[PDB]
């Protein structure tokens, strides 16, 4: 299934994920593609911050959903 | 000085802050106005998440800037 990962700074990342992938997995997939270290990422769906160990299905994130990416970088 | 706090879910909060306010004071101000607990707030400027102990000025947040707000939610 296809999900868009949109940055607050503009850019849309398209990914092919499995419905049961953990959020940590999506992060590894973003790293795969963009090179942004998982540790640096914060994923958000419906205005909320998502947790690592949960799955896309747990959050009701379905085909064509949009997630947001925020960076958590050293020293603010 | 006037800044805006936009949610990732279409709501703009207009605030009057001092250029030297820490990020935690702005959260206290959002709480005062929207009732959202400071603990459930994550503030973002230019695609990156903000540290509670730094000031708006440390991040070069000037008049009319837009900050974003995400919730780091847990219980119920």
Swiss-Prot record, chains A, B:
UniProt crosslink position (Glycyl lysine isopeptide (Gly-Lys) (interchain with K-? in acceptor proteins)): 76
Membrane spanning residue stretches: none
Superkingdom of origin organism: Eukaryota
Stretches assigned to the Ubiquitin-like domain: 1-76
Covalent cross-link Glycyl lysine isopeptide (Lys-Gly) (interchain with G-Cter in ubiquitin), where: 6, 11, 27, 29, 33, 48, 63
PTM-bearing positions, type Phosphoserine: 65
Location in the cell: Cytoplasm; Nucleus
Positions carrying ADP-ribosylglycine: 76
Protein modification: Phosphorylated at Ser-65 by PINK1 during mitophagy. Phosphorylated ubiquitin specifically binds and activates parkin (PRKN), triggering mitophagy. Phosphorylation does not affect E1-mediated E2 charging of ubiquitin but affects discharging of E2 enzymes to form polyubiquitin chains. It also affects deubiquitination by deubiquitinase enzymes such as USP30. Mono-ADP-ribosylated at the C-terminus by PARP9, a component of the PPAR9-DTX3L complex. ADP-ribosylation requires processing by E1 and E2 enzymes and prevents ubiquitin conjugation to substrates such as histones.
Annotated site residue numbers, Essential for function: 68
Site for Interacts with activating enzyme, residues: 54, 72
Coiled coil: none
Protein task: Exists either covalently attached to another protein, or free (unanchored). When covalently bound, it is conjugated to target proteins via an isopeptide bond either as a monomer (monoubiquitin), a polymer linked via different Lys residues of the ubiquitin (polyubiquitin chains) or a linear polymer linked via the initiator Met of the ubiquitin (linear polyubiquitin chains).
Protein name as annotated: Ubiquitin
Organism (species): Bos taurus
């Amino acid at each position: 299934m296809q999900i868009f990962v949109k940055t607050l700074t503009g850019k849309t990342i398209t990914l092919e994920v499995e419905p049961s992938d953990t959020i940590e997995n999506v992060k590894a997939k973003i790293q795969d593609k963009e090179g942004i270290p998982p540790d640096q990422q914060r994923l958000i769906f419906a205005g909320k911050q998502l947790e690592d160990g949960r799955t896309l299905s747990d959050y009701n994130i379905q085909k064509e959903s949009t997630l947001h990416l925020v960076l958590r970088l050293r020293g603010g």
